Structure formats: structure tokens, C-alpha cells
């Protein structure tokens, strides 16, 4: 009863299993979907991959096309390509995400952010995000990774730039306030007369 | 036989994980149902309009800081519950919404200035709803309500607005 | 005679009861008015809904038509539609008020307030 339990494993929902076989190491054409499945107790070892969409947030300061400092946080939903799991284990192991994303995500995000200024970054956030997703998809395809979503969750600027923008809008409100000074000036004219 | 019976509460659904057929493409409704005691297990998903609160500080089209809170009512699509369970997980909400809701809200808010944001709140909400519904449909989620519950601006801008209205009152006092 | 005591429930004072049945869950066309009612001890579970007018106060600062800060507190008397209680339980549960009003009331109130000056 112990041996049989040693020969059966379970792969849960959203997970897959590949086999490291002592005869030829990783089995190149064996990806096990949900179920029970059976393994030879000593020859075959199961490696379990979570193939569900996984969130990762990369937050970094980069430069806009004017070298302006942009604090950008990008959230990506990435998953391992289930049809290429064996090779992935041979090439990236179980830390594929930590091996790949901290480089491709950073480089793609910053290179794309460098194509726009602050105003374009804020007012075209969706288009910037889609460009980042396209480039990230092309780059992560080489590592048998799949991008489900790319979201620019944070996009802020330096203290000085924020203060200048607020000052500009304060000036707009002051221009609107100046209209009531004309109404007051009419009464002041009457008072003078 | 209690181990062979499982209860799907009201407003809930269950995806059946079978040890010899995987997750079943069909979803069982509410009530008490029979399953094979050990070969099958249920994963229970809330098929109710759940509320999510999203307070953000973003930029308008003029880039000025806007403190805007979006409250949404979301629910998984029952027919897509199996796929979701095998694609995103049981915590799909905390995996999906934190990205799509935030990005859609900020991208839409960047289309309007403060005046439009406040005086056209319904249009802003409608556009946020359109974008969020489109994006969430790809994750098997449905939106029951999209609401812009809070919307304020920076300290200096609010001071300037109050000064403008004070100027109007002073014109009246003249 | 504890079983008979367990098979009877009272719905009182402007309340209603719906049935969660183990043979299909919520029963779509069973809303029980005031009185004493009988439930099958295991199959049927009663869910009691207070269908009386209920006060809720939403107090918030919003912006007027000129973006002026307005501290507005709105009191609403809301109740669940008694003719649609089953569906509600399937869709909102017993915390329908906290699920719905904190969003629709806020948005409607502030959008309308933005149509007027002080």
C-alpha cells in the first residue's frame, strides 16, 4: 500500500506535469494534464508546473523621450507555454519567471517609455501599454512564455514636475477667478462715481 | 455518505475536478449534489456581484493629480468557471482586477480635465465601464456596476477653486 | 418533540422568507409573508429578509458645477423589492445594501451635485 502511493501523484487544476526519466532525463513529448497519472517509483520523477496566469509587478524609474524621470509600475500576467514545458525545464528550470522577466520586462518597458514624453505617456497610457505588450510578447516567445495582460498600473513624475503642473492648473483657476474681479470692478466704478 | 455529498450555496457554483477526467466542462448549480467520494472534488466559486474598491491618484489630460475611486461589481461567468479555474485560479480577482481596473481607470481619466471629470462624471463612468467590460470579458468576468464614487483634486487646486468662489461672493458684497 | 419545533419558523413584522432547497437551491417562486410557516427539517432552509424601509446616510464632499467643495449628506430610505427576493439572494445575498448603495448612491449624488452651483 506504501509502494502504490509512492507510484501515484496528483496534478491539480491549472497545473501540468513533466517527467524527468533516468533513462533519458526529461521526456521531450510528455505533458500531463489534470488527473492522477502514474510514475515508475525510481525511474520517473514528476515536475509540476503551475501554468496559470501569474501576476508580476515591475516598478522602476525610467526616462521619457526628454530624459524626464518617470516612475512607472507595470503589472504583467504571464504564464509558461504549456505546449513547451519539457524544454523549458531543460532550459530555465522552475524559476523561469525570475530568470527571464526581470530583464526583458525592464528593457522593453524602459525602451518603450523612452519613445514618449510625459504628456503622451499619461494621455496615451493604453497605446503605450499595448506597445509594451507587443514587444514583451515577441521577446518572451523566445523563452516559451505567454503574456495574458500588460497593465501600466503606476505612472507618476518628480516632485518638481508635479508642482509645476499643479501651478499651471492653479493659474487656470486664477484666470477663472479674474472674471469676478470685473464684476467687482463695476461696483467699484459706481462707488467711485 | 456525507463525504459523497457537497452543497453549493445560493449564488455559488461548483467546478468538478475529476481525478480521471480532469476538470469537467459543466458547472453544477445550487443545492446538494452527489460526487464520487474520493475520485471527484468540488471547487466553489461565488457567482455573486462582488464589490471591488479601487482608489487611485492619477493624471488628467492636463496631467494634474486626480484622486478618483472606482467601485465595481464583478462576477465570474458561470460557463467560463472551469476555464478560469484552470487558467487564472480561485483568486482570479486578485490576479486580474488589480491590473485591468487600475489601467482602464487611469487611461480613461487621462481623457478629461478636472472640469469635465466633475461635470461629466456620468460620461467618464460610461467610458470606464465600456473599456473595463471589454477587457474583463477576456478573463471570463462580467461587470454588474461601474461607479466613480469619489473624485477630488490636489490641495493647491482646491484652494484656487475656493478662492475663485470667494471672489464671486466678494463681487456680490460690492 | 424537538423535530416539530425544528420544522416551524416564524416570519414577523414586515419580514419575508425565501427557501434555499437542497433540490435546486433557492426556489424561484416562493416568497413567504408574515406568519408561521413549515419547512422540511433538512431539505429546506429559510432565509429571512427585512423588507421594511431602511435608512442609510451617505456623507461625502463632492464638487459643484464650478468644482467648489460641497459637503453633502444624503439620507435614503431603501428596501428590497419583495416580489424579487429569491433572485436577490442568488445575486446579492443578505448584504445587498452594502454591496449596492455605497456605489450607486455616491455616483448618482455626486454626478447630480455637479450640475448646480452652491
Residues B84 and B78: their CA atoms lie apart, in Å, by 10
Give the residue on A whose Cα is nearest the Cα of B138: A148
Which residues make beta-bridge pairs with B56?
A: B68
Cα separation of B85 and A14, whole Å?
7
Q: Is C102 on the interface with B (CB under 8 A)?
A: yes
B-chain CB neighbours of C90 within 8 Å are 10-11, 30, 47-48
| Distance in angstroms (rounded) separating the CA atoms of residues C32 and B153 | 49
**Which residue, among C104, C52, C49, has the nearest Cα to C74 in the 3D structure?**
C104
Query: Using what technique was this structure determined?
Result: cryo-EM
- From the CA atom positions of chain C, what is the Rg in Å? 20
3-state secondary structure of C23: coil
Determine contact, residues B92/B142, Cβ cutoff 8 Å: no
Contacts of B11 in chain C (CB under 8 A): 89-93
Give the angle B166-B167-B173 at the CA atoms, nearest 5°. 90
Residue B56 burial by CB count (10 A; 0-12/13-18/19+): exposed, middle or buried? middle
Q: Do B121 and C114 form a contact (C-beta atoms < 8 A)?
A: yes
Give backbone dihedrals phi and psi of B17, rounded to 5 degrees, phi first: -95, 115
Q: What is the resolution of this structure in A?
A: 2.4
For residues A53 and A137, what is the distance between their CA atoms, to the nearest angstrom?
A: 14
How far is Cα B143 from Cα B145, in angstroms, rounded to an integer?
6
Paired residues of A59 in beta bridges = A73
Give buried/exposed letters for B80-113 (b at 16+ CB in 10 A, else e): bbbebbbbbbbebbebbbbbbbbbbbbbbbbbbb
Chain C: list its partners (3+ Cβ pairs within 8 Å). B
B65 strand-pairing partners: B59
Compute the nearest-CA separation of C63 from chain B (Å): 7
Nearest to B51 by CA among B79, B72, B70: B72
Cell numbers representing residue C28 in the block: 424561484
Closest CA to C93 of C20, C37, C30, C12: C20
Closest CA of chain B from A81, distance in Å: 12
Contact indicator for B48, B13 with CB cutoff of 8 Å:
no
Amino acid at each position: 500500500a506504501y509502494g502504490v502511493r509512492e507510484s501515484v501523484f496528483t496534478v491539480e487544476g491549472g497545473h501540468r506535469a513533466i517527467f524527468f526519466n533516468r533513462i533519458g532525463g526529461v521526456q521531450q513529448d510528455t505533458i500531463l494534464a489534470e488527473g492522477l497519472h502514474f510514475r515508475i517509483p525510481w525511474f520517473q520523477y514528476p515536475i509540476i508546473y503551475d501554468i496559470r496566469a501569474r501576476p508580476r509587478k515591475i516598478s522602476s524609474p525610467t526616462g521619457s523621450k526628454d530624459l524626464q524621470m518617470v516612475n512607472i509600475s507595470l503589472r504583467v500576467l504571464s504564464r509558461p507555454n504549456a505546449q513547451e514545458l519539457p524544454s523549458m525545464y531543460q532550459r530555465l528550470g522552475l524559476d523561469y519567471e525570475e530568470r527571464v522577466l526581470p530583464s526583458i520586462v525592464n528593457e522593453v518597458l524602459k525602451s518603450v517609455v523612452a519613445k514618449f514624453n510625459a504628456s503622451q505617456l499619461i494621455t496615451q497610457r493604453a497605446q503605450v501599454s499595448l506597445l509594451i505588450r507587443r514587444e514583451l510578447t515577441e521577446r518572451a516567445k523566445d523563452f516559451s512564455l505567454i503574456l495574458d495582460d500588460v497593465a501600466i498600473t503606476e505612472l507618476s513624475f518628480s516632485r518638481e514636475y508635479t508642482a509645476a503642473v499643479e501651478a499651471k492648473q492653479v493659474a487656470q483657476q486664477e484666470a477663472q477667478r479674474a472674471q469676478f474681479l470685473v464684476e467687482k470692478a463695476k461696483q467699484e466704478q459706481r462707488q467711485k462715481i | 455518505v456525507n463525504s459523497a455529498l457537497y452543497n453549493v450555496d445560493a449564488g455559488h457554483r461548483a467546478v468538478i475536478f475529476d481525478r480521471f477526467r480532469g476538470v469537467q466542462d459543466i458547472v453544477v448549480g445550487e443545492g446538494t449534489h452527489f460526487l464520487i467520494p474520493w475520485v471527484q472534488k468540488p471547487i466553489i466559486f461565488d457567482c455573486r456581484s462582488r464589490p471591488r474598491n479601487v482608489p487611485v491618484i492619477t493624471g488628467s489630460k492636463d496631467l494634474q493629480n486626480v484622486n478618483i475611486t472606482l467601485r465595481i461589481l464583478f462576477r465570474p461567468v458561470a460557463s467560463q468557471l472551469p476555464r478560469i479555474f484552470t487558467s487564472i485560479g480561485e483568486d482570479y480577482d486578485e490576479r486580474v482586477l488589480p491590473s485591468i481596473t487600475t489601467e482602464i481607470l487611469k487611461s480613461v481619466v487621462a481623457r478629461f480635465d478636472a472640469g469635465e471629470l466633475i461635470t461629466q462624471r456620468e460620461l467618464v463612468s460610461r467610458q470606464v465601464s465600456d473599456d473595463l467590460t471589454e477587457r474583463a470579458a477576456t478573463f471570463g468576468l462580467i461587470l454588474d456596476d461601474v461607479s466613480l464614487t469619489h473624485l477630488t483634486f490636489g490641495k493647491e487646486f482646491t484652494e484656487a477653486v475656493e478662492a475663485k468662489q470667494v471672489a464671486q461672493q466678494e463681487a456680490e458684497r460690492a
